[PDB]
Amino acid sequence: MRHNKKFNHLGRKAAHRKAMLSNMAASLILHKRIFTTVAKAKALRIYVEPLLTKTKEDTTHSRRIAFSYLQNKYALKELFGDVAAKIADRPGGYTRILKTGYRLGDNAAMCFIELVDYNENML
Amino acid sequence: MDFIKIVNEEFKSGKEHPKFNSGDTITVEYRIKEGNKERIQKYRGVVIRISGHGDKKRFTVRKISDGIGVERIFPIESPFIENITVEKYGKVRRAKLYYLRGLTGKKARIKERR
Amino acid sequence: RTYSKVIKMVKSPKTGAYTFQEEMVPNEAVKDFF
Amino acid sequence: AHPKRRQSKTRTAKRRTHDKAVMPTLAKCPNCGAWHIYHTVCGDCGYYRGKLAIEKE
Amino acid sequence: MIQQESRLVVADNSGAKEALCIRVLGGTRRRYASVGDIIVVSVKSVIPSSDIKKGAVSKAVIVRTKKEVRRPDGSYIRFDDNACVLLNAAGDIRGSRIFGPVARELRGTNMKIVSLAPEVL
Amino acid sequence: PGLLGKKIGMTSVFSAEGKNLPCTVIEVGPCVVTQVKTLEKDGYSALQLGFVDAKEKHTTKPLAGHFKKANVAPKRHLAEFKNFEGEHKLGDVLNVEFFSDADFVDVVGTSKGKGFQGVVKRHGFGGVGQATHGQHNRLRAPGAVGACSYPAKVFKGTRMAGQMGNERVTVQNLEVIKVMPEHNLLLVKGSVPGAKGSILLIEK
RNA sequence: GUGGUUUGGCACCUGAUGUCGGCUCGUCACAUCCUGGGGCUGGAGAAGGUCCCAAGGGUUGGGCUCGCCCAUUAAAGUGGCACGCGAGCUGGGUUCAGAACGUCGUGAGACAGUUCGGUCUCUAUCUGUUGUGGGCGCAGGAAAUUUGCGAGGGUCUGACACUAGUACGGACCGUGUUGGACAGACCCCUGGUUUACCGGUUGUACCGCCAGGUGCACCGCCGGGUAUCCACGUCUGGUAAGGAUAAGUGCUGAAAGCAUCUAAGCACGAAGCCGGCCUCAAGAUAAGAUUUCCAUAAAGGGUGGUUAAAGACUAUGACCUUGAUAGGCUGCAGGUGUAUGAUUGGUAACAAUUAAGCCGAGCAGUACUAAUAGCCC
RNA sequence: AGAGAUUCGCGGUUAAGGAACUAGGCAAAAUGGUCCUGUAACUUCGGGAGAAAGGACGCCUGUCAGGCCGCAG
Ligand SMILES: [K+]
Ligand SMILES: [K+]
Ligand SMILES: [K+]
Ligand SMILES: [K+]
Ligand SMILES: [K+]
Ligand SMILES: [Mg+2]
Ligand SMILES: [Mg+2]
Ligand SMILES: [Mg+2]
Ligand SMILES: [Mg+2]
Ligand SMILES: [Mg+2]
Ligand SMILES: [Mg+2]
Ligand SMILES: [Mg+2]
Ligand SMILES: [Mg+2]
Ligand SMILES: [Mg+2]
Ligand SMILES: [Mg+2]
Ligand SMILES: [Mg+2]
Ligand SMILES: [Mg+2]
Ligand SMILES: [Mg+2]
Ligand SMILES: [Mg+2]
Ligand SMILES: [Mg+2]
Ligand SMILES: [Mg+2]
Ligand SMILES: [Mg+2]
Ligand SMILES: [Mg+2]
Ligand code: NA
Ligand code: NA
Ligand code: NA
């Protein structure tokens, strides 16, 4: 049974899962759109929106809290620079997941996840 | 329209009590039925745990009686509690003081707040 | 000792013989039974 | 542990009754006039629900 | 929660110090005994010049439990030890003093003479 | 006779004599009569009751016509109850005051679903051997499932692994603590089957 | 005479029908251990003894290895099922190679013997069993609610108190109160888990450095811990006997002017039988009944999407933009326990004030993100 | 790659009890470092012996004491 257990383990030990989520979040902040598996993107969304919300408080404390998750200074600088001003005054829902197709090697369901405010065509 | 809150509010029992946390020394006055009489028993000791939601909380009080440790769990809404008095305010660093079980004498003292 | 045995004769519903039906009742409650 | 007898062709085929390839769920996208998988990005034009999602130069 | 082979303190002024639970009385497959329950014990250690002998099979009533006991008023009580009081064949206290507190449940266990206790909780 | 209900959750209250009573809160809600079954037409007497307000978006055309004939707003859950003292017509409304003179009730629900469960959880099997002392791989195994060549079969009704829970369960004789008509609430002593939000049948 | 359950007789099955006890899981019989009902008694009462009916449910844990003992219990029944059960376990015993003692033998070696050590293989095809789907059928297509042909489960029991220390030490009958065991459901309480989460701390590495963090060391270790899942927890259940009966007790009454419970009739009379209680249940091909709707968009569906206290896959439930389905966001219940920095103190390690801070699997509100009526019956 | 049934393999925690398990404490748990005290029967006088049993341990300050923090050095 897994009644009301609300996060995906993603076939990994806990430390590996946390490291993978951190790497994905840095990649998504640096390049505004990434291509992944659907399950990984759905897990990343829950991981990464609180981190983007934390930029609404422009403080050293919030910067340090965000760095404790990221551990990447380039990603932190970009996030508290351009990404913050872009996602300012948006009440949640900063990301979007769209399904694309299937891989050749293992038939994995593929998608892209992107920051919403960097897709001008979708507004 | 929270039905659990409505039910709790209609069945609300007990009285308001002075604020206390874990690490505080308190005296609880408890009504007891000794056959046909109504007695008040006083139980004084340290609060080692508080748990629950809102007015449905329970607190555990520990005392030493003839060198035998005793713990009592009281519901804070209980209608048998006639008074709670905070004698000394404590200074602890955690929420549950389970480590006090294995300590006695001067080793089990608790620093006062002021 | 307020309880008491109460047996009443009554015609049978499938044969037609004066069978007996018994129950326990209170001492004051025997009026309702008989 | 071990098959007492070989299976007949009939028994084998009866078990294989439920072996089938799955049809993909295909939508038409009447603008571009060609097939794509429902609830996915139309890979040719790069559109999705009438909005350019992926731009290809 | 006392079962067979559990060791108890003997909380009276009789000679016994420690006792071992042989059997919990009250029915087939009755596993646990709590405050106010009667058990059979074997005396494991006595004081020098003790009236009761080491290895004596006796009856006892449980008066303190480490595992917590629930009262109908929503309260609970637990002690730091597991303690019993020895009884004779007639079902009366073998000794004359009780050491330490006893559970309030003993009032209704027809065991009123344990009112020798320093404090009933 | 009875009404449809919805399980809200559990709490604990204090009685008048100072007893901590565990309590289940149930929303019994206004149930509307949607069909009267008679001996002449249906072969037995019963009342069909509807419980939770639905929309035309979620009502199919057959059920929409059924409710139109009953001349009531469409309901989500329908259930049948028998032995109703007093006559009731089409479209009548019954509330939690129906239980205002009951000391005990019966509650029928659907228990929580456990999925596929082994013999240890499903039937309380003791397990083969000990954790040590030569144990290889049968710590939660069933053991033997029959006798030798004389029966030469496993009997019907042998207790085995399989689906556990997610089935209809009746809890008998639950004491009623309080009826609250202003909120359509029923308070029962004890627990009832299912998770919060499940639909219950409450029989007087 | 009966049984085949003891020691035997026979040698009919057997290019392997492969092993004593214990464990696990059972199932059946009744030659009845307990509980229920009766007859007789050398049955005053109370205890019993023997016999009859009765197989529903129960029928402990230890010190030793059929039996003995300890402590209980209402009771600790006897047997069958390849002395039930090793493609289910075990390996104490037994069958094997090493070695030793006693005894026998010139010896190799041996035993109405003893002693220490000594590999338990196989991925389940058919049938069987426990669960769960797909197809078609049931007068043409459907959405619901249902009757019950039948099946399965359930069925135990103690101690007290009054009657009453009376009838004859010590009652039957009758009534009330609380236990044990077992089962089902549940998580408010108590207790456990809780590699979500929070904090303390050792070693080491990195960001010149510092501060603050982070990786690794069993989750490094240690202290807590929500939801979920749980029992050690909490609620609920088992009664009575509706009908027909057993052994027995009788009414009336001939054959047989008497007698006789029976041959005609009629009352009774058990935990046993059929019901009542719970679950399944119309593939019940004898395919039942009732209400409503009836082809294409969203009459009904399917594929699809957001998901779930539903789930191996399925199936099932909710929602799919005139939408709160999931996430996020804004607030709360709640876990942890007072962050970062700045002052004030201290020679310092550190302490105090300040907003605690972080998290929030639960709850409420809110379309910011995702849920395209496309395609096919 | 998903998903996170049963069951197995390798690991973690567990109320109250603590060998009641079992052929047998098998396995696991527990013990564990440095320094300072203190070490029995017996003995072939070498041993037994690390017998057994106790105490201290972090950081700061001052020439071992004073202080500081933690459930735990
Ligand atoms: K057969
Ligand atoms: K809970
Ligand atoms: K929890
Ligand atoms: K413990
Ligand atoms: K033993
Ligand atoms: Mg895995
Ligand atoms: Mg197949
Ligand atoms: Mg489930
Ligand atoms: Mg086990
Ligand atoms: Mg083995
Ligand atoms: Mg193993
Ligand atoms: Mg011959
Ligand atoms: Mg052969
Ligand atoms: Mg055999
Ligand atoms: Mg074998
Ligand atoms: Mg076999
Ligand atoms: Mg040899
Ligand atoms: Mg060896
Ligand atoms: Mg690690
Ligand atoms: Mg390394
Ligand atoms: Mg334990
Ligand atoms: Mg044993
Ligand atoms: Mg070992
Ligand atoms: Na010789
Ligand atoms: Na039709
Ligand atoms: Na939330």
Sheet holding B25-34, edge to edge: B81-88, B25-34, B37-51, B58-65, B68-75, E76-79, E69-70
E4 touches strand H (CB under 7 A): yes
Residues 9-48 of B with CB under 8 A from E: 32, 34, 43
F159 touches strand H (CB under 7 A): no
Q: Note the CA–C1' distance, C19 to G268, in angstroms.
A: 10
Residues 6+ apart with CB under 8 A from C5: C22, C23, C24
d(CA E21, CA E7): 6
Residues 1-40 of E with CB under 8 A from B: none
Give strand pairing partners of A114: A33, A96
Give strand pairing partners of E66: none
Which ligand is nearest to the Cα of residue F146, counting in written order?
16
Contacts 24+ apart (CB under 8 A), F150-156: none
Side-chain half-sphere exposure of D54, counting CA atoms within 13 A: 19
Instruction: Flag whether F touches E (3+ CB pairs, 8 A cutoff).
Output: yes
Q: How far is the CA of F126 from the centre of ligand 14 (A)?
A: 22
D10 three-state secondary structure: helix
A80 touches strand G (CB under 7 A): no
For chain B, the helix, strand and coil percentages under 3-state DSSP, each to the nearest 5: 20, 45, 35
Tell me how far CA of residue B78 lies from CA of D31, E17, F59, F72, in angstroms: 72, 39, 49, 47
Buried b (16+ CB within 10 A) or exposed e, B55-91: eeebbbbbbebeebbbbbbbbbbbbbbeebebeebbe
* Token reading at F10: 């559990």
What's the gap between Cα E10 and its chain centre? 7
What's the gap between Cα C29 and its chain centre? 12
Side-chain half-sphere exposure of B68, counting CA atoms within 13 A: 26
The residue of E64, E67, E70, E76 whose CB has the most chain B CBs within 10 angstroms, and thus the best one to mutate to test that interface, is E76
Task: Report the residue count for chain A.
Answer: 123
H/E segment holding residue A63:
helix A60-70
First CA to last CA across chain C, in angstroms?
A: 19
d(CA B60, CA B97): 10
C32 three-state secondary structure: helix
Residues 6+ apart with CB under 8 A from A31: none
Residues 6+ apart with CB under 8 A from A41: A97, A111, A112, A113
Q: Note the CA–C1' distance, D18 to H7, in angstroms.
A: 27
**CB < 8 Å to D53, chain A:** 98, 119, 121-122
Instruction: Flag whether B touches E (3+ CB pairs, 8 A cutoff).
Output: yes
**CB < 8 Å to A3, chain F:** 112
* Token reading at B3: 């039905």
Q: Which of residues 134-193 of F touch strand G (CB under 7 A)?
A: 134-136, 138, 141-151, 153-175, 189-193
Nearest by CB to residue D41, choosing from A98, A119, A121, is A98
For nucleotide H5, give the residue with the nearest CA to its C1'.
F116
d(CA E105, CA E87): 18
E54 three-state secondary structure: coil
Give strand pairing partners of F185: F27, F180
Task: Report the residue count for chain B.
Answer: 114
d(CA D41, CA D51): 10
Q: Do A55 and A80 contact (CB within 8 A), yes or no?
A: yes
d(CA B101, CA B104): 8
Q: Which of residues 102-121 of E touch strand H (CB under 7 A)?
A: none
What are the backbone angles phi and psi of residue A86, rounded to the nearest 5°?
-75, -40
For chain D, the helix, strand and coil percentages under 3-state DSSP, each to the nearest 5: 15, 15, 70
What sign results for the dihedral spanned by CA atoms E46, E50, E55, E58? negative
Tell whether A1 is within 8 A of chain F (Cβ): yes
Residue F15 CB coordination number (10 Å): 14
| Closest C-alpha to E43, from E90, E95, E78, E1 | E95
Nearest by CB to residue E118, choosing from B34, B66, B73, is B66
Q: Which residues, chain by chain, have CB under 5 Å from ion ligand 1? A: F 152
Q: At D6, which amino acid appears?
A: R
Q: At F168, which amino acid appears?
A: R
d(CA F94, CA F81): 12
Tell whether E29 is within 8 A of chain F (Cβ): no
Query: CB–CB of B78 and F14 under 8 A?
Result: yes
Give the CA dihedral F86, F87, F93, F99, nearest 10 degrees.
20
* Token reading at C32: 């309702």
What is the experimental resolution, given in Å to one decimal place?
2.7
